[PDB]
Design a protein around this ligand. Structure first.
Ligand SMILES: NC(=O)C1=CN([C@@H]2O[C@H](COP(=O)(O)OP(=O)(O)OC[C@H]3O[C@@H](n4cnc5c(N)ncnc54)[C@H](OP(=O)(O)O)[C@@H]3O)[C@@H](O)[C@H]2O)C=CC1
Ligand SMILES: CCc1nc(N)nc(N)c1C#C[C@H](C)c1cc(OC)cc(-c2ccncc2)c1
Length: 189
């Protein structure tokens, strides 16, 4: 099944957090994340979200598990097991897929350690990067960064992203405060 990374990062250094939290609250970006990770093409299927343990624990109490999606939590301590109908515990993406039944799309949703490893895993064929801009990038506190060899990847045209997201609205240069952001798709060369 189709495995993709979905992330929002501040250019050009591709920062994603400071002190274990996100340096922005972008309202439309959140809805985009929600729609893309939920939308299925075929009947009787749903999407999977894979995340690290720390990321799982960072999600607001009443937002976890993320509804309408199969949640996979990663820990190097976990046994490959099905907790309930919505939650799976695993020690690798390799194992979690073998435990999965009838999943259409798989989304890697965080965090920094999970991103920086799975980026070089050949099962991952797509990057969904919300590229964020700011007039003064250095003036925002940042400690955790993406380590993406984007030279080895190809930014696709908007029309390929539009096919991927289906009937989802893709606006240009979304301005929330001083931040400006765009949605982009990447594939392996
Ligand atoms: N902008 C964005 O789209 C997003 C940004 N973020 C940011 O990222 C930061 C979180 O990153 P981080 O602290 O690294 O959290 P992670 O979600 O990456 O948690 C890391 C944990 O995942 C487990 N793990 C890591 N690698 C593997 C592996 N290969 N196989 C199995 N388990 C593994 C380990 O658990 P264990 O110790 O149990 O073995 C480890 O402790 C936050 O600051 C947040 O702001 C997060 C999500 C999205
Ligand atoms: C920015 C949303 C987001 N956008 C994109 N493009 N990629 C991502 N990987 C995430 C993400 C994320 C993590 C899992 C997260 C952390 C959190 O705690 C800070 C709250 C939410 C969340 C708030 C609102 N609704 C559902 C989930 C999501």
């Amino acid at each position: 099944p189709n495995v993709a990374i979905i992330v929002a990062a501040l250019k050009p250094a591709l920062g994603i957090g400071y002190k274990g939290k996100m340096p922005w609250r972008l309202r439309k970006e959140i809805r985009y994340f929600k729609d893309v990770t939920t939308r299925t093409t075929k009947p009787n299927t749903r999407n999977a979200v894979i995340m690290g343990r720390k990321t799982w624990e960072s999600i607001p109490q009443k937002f976890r598990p993320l509804p309408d999606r199969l949640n996979i939590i990663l820990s190097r301590s976990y046994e490959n097991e099905i907790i309930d109908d919505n939650i799976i515990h695993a020690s690798s993406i390799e194992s979690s897929l073998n435990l999965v039944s009838d999943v259409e799309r798989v989304f890697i949703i965080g965090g920094a350690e999970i991103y920086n490893e799975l980026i070089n895993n050949s099962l991952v064929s797509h990057l969904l990067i919300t590229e964020i801009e700011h007039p003064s990038p250095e003036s925002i506190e940042m400690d955790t960064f993406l380590k993406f060899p984007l030279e080895s990847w190809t930014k696709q045209p908007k029309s390929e992203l539009q096919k991927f997201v289906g009937d989802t609205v893709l606006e240009d240069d979304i301005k929330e405060g001083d931040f400006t952001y765009n949605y982009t798709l990447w594939t392996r060369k």
